[PDB]
Design a protein around this ligand. Structure first.
Ligand code: NI
Length: 109
């Protein structure tokens, strides 16, 4: 089981940095097995789903990256419009190194 304190902290901080504090009471994380995806978001239920099968492999920065990406879908919509990718780069200048560690971990054991 992944420590909830770490997840609560990253969620709160990312919501604050993405100027989504007005939606703070509605946004939550749920951990469950997902098929062919690391994370998803229910835009109606304001719920971020993290794949239970990959979560024990992730670093704290990787979790922060995943949560930032799903919240940017809540903020901007379905497609990675210019404003989406620039906000993601602003939070993660090392975006490229995060994604290579992310891919290597999805390859599993
Ligand atoms: Ni996306």
């Amino acid at each position: 089981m992944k420590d909830r304190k770490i997840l609560n902290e990253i969620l709160s901080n990312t919501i604050n940095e993405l100027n989504l504090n007005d939606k703070k009471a509605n946004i939550k994380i749920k951990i469950k097995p997902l098929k062919r995806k690391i994370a998803s978001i229910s835009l109606t239920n304001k719920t971020i789903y993290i794949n239970k099968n990959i979560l024990p492999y992730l670093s704290d920065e990787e979790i922060r990256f995943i949560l930032a990406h799903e919240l940017l879908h809540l903020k901007y919509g379905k497609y990675h419009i210019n404003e989406f990718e620039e906000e993601l780069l602003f939070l993660f200048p090392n975006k490229e190194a995060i994604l290579i560690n992310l891919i290597n971990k999805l390859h599993q054991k």
